[PDB]
Amino acid sequence: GTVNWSVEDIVKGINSNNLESQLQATQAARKLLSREKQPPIDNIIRAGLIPKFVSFLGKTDCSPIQFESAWALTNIASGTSEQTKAVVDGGAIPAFISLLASPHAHISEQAVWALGNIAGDGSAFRDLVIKHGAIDPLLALLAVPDLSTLACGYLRNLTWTLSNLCRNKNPAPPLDAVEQILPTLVRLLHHNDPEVLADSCWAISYLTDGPNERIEMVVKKGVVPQLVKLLGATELPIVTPALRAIGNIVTGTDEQTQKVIDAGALAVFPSLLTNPKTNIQKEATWTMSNITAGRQDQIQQVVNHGLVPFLVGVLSKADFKTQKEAAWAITNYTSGGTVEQIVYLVHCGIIEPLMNLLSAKDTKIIQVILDAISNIFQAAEKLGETEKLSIMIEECGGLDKIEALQRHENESVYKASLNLIEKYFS
């Protein structure tokens, strides 16, 4: 019936003055745009069909053509920025927002989806969707006593679109828009559907990626314990954004970081730091590095939770990206830690894997490692143990590695290493 129409036929139907013919042709367009491979989005755009689809959105008297054009426009908007722009340029934004009030759940849902694609394109369209007043009617769709009464797919689409309104930076979303959205987000974060949880965590992760003021507005909503709970979920699609959000939060103030610790987050890290997915290990190690950049009492928590041997572990063997984060965690630890905490570090076996990493071509990690080594010597100086450390670095091949670095290209590298040698290795 409406399967596999040429664009030409679609145009002919839509240009006819017969609403049924238009409906038929519009559905045909929807099916082209929904096919598995290479939807002919540009061809549809060039045929000049967008203004017609947009006008069909306003036809309250013919709900099916509203649905079909909503669906077609949604899929056009799912493409490149230029393709999304064509949809916006046609006046689709306010028309879609008007459809959020539709008595037909399947039409309202489709409009939710479309606005998600538009906002998803980037900051400008995101903020334009907000300026057109999308937030109030979107939130109103979620104003029910129990989210469980909503159709599952419907709730998922709502959550996803809301997460796109929280997404992107340069600039980040308007503060008042974030305040307006947050209480619903907190609520979605306690829902029991895995996809709603995943997308809610993504939204929280976007919101906490920025200046400490941004983190604060999320953290004061009391979501950290729930985020930590989700950190221990069995679904990787939940753990991943939950962990990204926890990582973002510990980039904040000592107080913001302490909330993460207080909520029991550190107890999950033996699993995270040995997680089969390398991206989880990397994010988790990055997180640890920002925690070891914290207060001495926060470093002590890392110690108490038995996490230092886990850091020695990733420093010893992990993908290179994770190893670099491990190196950072060590330099941060030795910069902020007490002498005793630093001594503990050496006793866990940090020295050997630390030295082995000096074979890395990465110039930045070499700097990180040399610094850490400097910091550890400074602690051994307070204890008069400098020579015990020199010998330790000597026997694992470290001194050989420091020696060569004297001839390294980078200025601070050979300078840092020359200092080490002519000081502790003479």
Binding site: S34, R35, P39, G79, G116, R167, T251, G252, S289, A293
Partner: peptide, 23 residues
């Protein structure tokens, strides 16, 4: 004592910006 290190930009693990409805 060092400063915190904010997230460095990247879209790799990041989920899709947009969704096309197939059915």
């Amino acid at each position: 004592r060092r400063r915190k290190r904010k997230r460095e930009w990247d879209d790799d693990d990041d989920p899709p910006k947009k969704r096309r409805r197939l059915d």
